[PDB]
């Protein structure tokens, strides 16, 4: 239990309820290589919400791309999880999602954004613990970071997500 | 949005 | 202690600080029988607050009535509990309280409201862990829900409390 | 891990993210005494923040004085801690801080405020878990409280901090 | 402010 209880704590400790979420990833290097070596391809982020009793969402990232971005890009995906209050929410999930890679030298953040495809199975009321991830396979070119630049400082990167709240 | 493979 | 710890975590997980609380009761069917069979007549809801350092409150529900609603109605009560910051709060508790049984087909929510009876020992500064529950014994008819209708969906119901904040 | 785990939970239970914090100190007499006997001169408060991902701060109090206030005053300090998101914030810390000793008869609060001294090592980006606390050595005279008055009720006092948010 | 001693 102690194990599962510690997971609940960290989850709570990380969760936010205004559709804004900043994901800090430490042990960049190590987690970077693991992605390369195919040992640990992806990494889920803690869950966050659009409101106190809003939608439950999280992010999934491949520090060494997935699909059209494999080995070359950094893929970042938005994930619509099954929320304890889904039956009170309007479906399909139709909220603009902005994703960013923060520049710890605040001079040029890597930003991208998209509007949910209402037909996709990624924005339909969850039946599983999580829906299928969808986002940006070519979010940012490995070289754009890795080496040095200004996105990886003290071996750590920050991913930021902003789920627009229009209509909520 | 492009689902993950 | 891991038991007492898991309890605190969930209570924290459930707490809110804006006077708005939404209570989800799963295993409705089971908890509904347990109430009928008198094995478990009442159920307390996790605590919530009017503000970060405001009044601490909770709800107590009788899935098969209490008092004038026993056997026929769903009794819903508001509870003023002893808060860590009571010494800084004005007493007696005097904030309007709105209780609701949410329709998961949003077509007609069971709604009721009341203004605290200042002379009541339910709204006096707590001496015990909890003051005496006060509320609506005849909140909602058993037939109004149970069967099917639209309040119970996927074997769960949602109770929502709204504590007005005028003056706070 | 149990011990350390309970600590993470209590810290979470106490944290706030809008720069306003209210610290309740129970067993005042006992701790007041431990301070006089020099067994436990100072007490750190739980951490709090300017925003969900803002600066991490806490408080340090000397129930029986520090420096120019030793033996005669209650010394209250502000502490800039190493936040998990320091790399994203502007340094040095440059937010006005207001410190208060609440009067539980809301008649006369002990209040004092200050703008950070940019050249001070207290407001530089943290290298250690905490910077050097700075604040008010002569915050409040022991007599002002202790005895009876209205700052110590039911063996407890309340300290309040308000970190101005201009520019954030 | 005045640093703690």
From Swiss-Prot, chains A, C, D:
It comes from the Eukaryota. Phosphorylated at several serine residues within the first 128 amino acid residues. Residues 18-163 form the MATH domain. It is found in: Cytoplasm. Homotrimer. Heterotrimer with TRAF1. Heterotrimer with TRAF3 (via TRAF domain). The domain containing the RING-type and the first TRAF-type zinc finger can also form homodimers (in vitro). Interacts with TNFRSF1B/TNFR2. Interacts with TNFRSF5/CD40. Interacts with TNFRSF4, TNFRSF7/CD27, TNFRSF8/CD30, TNFRSF9/CD137, TNFRSF11A/RANK, TNFRSF13B/TACI, TNFRSF14, TNFRSF16/NGFR, TNFRSF17/BCMA, TNFRSF18/AITR, TNFRSF19/TROY, TNFRSF19L/RELT and EDAR. Stimulation of TNF-alpha receptor TNFRSF1A leads to the formation of two distinct signaling complexes. E3 ubiquitin-protein ligase that regulates activation of NF-kappa-B and JNK and plays a central role in the regulation of cell survival and apoptosis. Catalyzes 'Lys-63'-linked ubiquitination of target proteins, such as BIRC3, IKBKE, MLST8, RIPK1 and TICAM1. Is an essential constituent of several E3 ubiquitin-protein ligase complexes, where it promotes the ubiquitination of target proteins by bringing them into contact with other E3 ubiquitin ligases. Belongs to the TNF receptor-associated factor family. A subfamily. The coiled coil domain mediates homo- and hetero-oligomerization. This is TNF receptor-associated factor 2. It comes from Homo sapiens.
UniProtKB/Swiss-Prot annotation, chains B, E:
Expressed in activated thymocytes, splenic T cells, CD4(+), and CD8(+) T-cells. Coiled coil: none annotated. It is found in: Cell membrane. It comes from the Eukaryota. Induction: Up-regulated after cell treatment by PMA and ionomycin, suggesting that optimal expression requires both protein kinase C activation and increase in intracellular calcium. Receptor for TNFSF9/4-1BBL. Conveys a signal that enhances CD8(+) T-cell survival, cytotoxicity, and mitochondrial activity, thereby promoting immunity against viruses and tumors. Predominantly homodimeric, but may also exist as a monomer. Associates with p56-LCK. Interacts with TRAF1, TRAF2 and TRAF3. This is Tumor necrosis factor receptor superfamily member 9. It comes from Mus musculus (Mouse). The lineage of its organism: Eukaryota, Metazoa, Chordata, Craniata, Vertebrata.
């Amino acid at each position: 239990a102690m194990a599962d209880l510690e997971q609940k704590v960290l989850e709570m400790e990380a969760s936010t309820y205004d559709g804004v979420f900043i994901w800090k990833i430490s042990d960049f290097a190590r987690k970077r290589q693991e992605a390369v070596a195919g040992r640990i391809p992806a990494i889920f982020s803690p869950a966050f919400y659009t409101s106190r009793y809003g939608y439950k969402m999280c992010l999934r990232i491949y520090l060494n791309g997935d699909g059209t971005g494999r080995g070359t890009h950094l893929s970042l995906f938005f994930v619509v999880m099954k929320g304890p209050n889904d039956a009170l929410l309007r479906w399909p999930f139709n909220q603009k999602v902005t994703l960013m890679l923060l520049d710890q030298n605040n001079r040029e953040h890597v930003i991208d954004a998209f509007r949910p495809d209402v037909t996709s199975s990624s924005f339909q009321r969850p039946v599983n613990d999580m829906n299928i991830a969808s986002g940006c396979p070519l979010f940012c070119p490995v070289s754009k970071m890795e080496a040095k630049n200004s996105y990886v400082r003290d071996d750590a990167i920050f991913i930021k997500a902003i789920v627009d709240l229009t209509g909520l | 949005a492009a689902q993950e493979e």
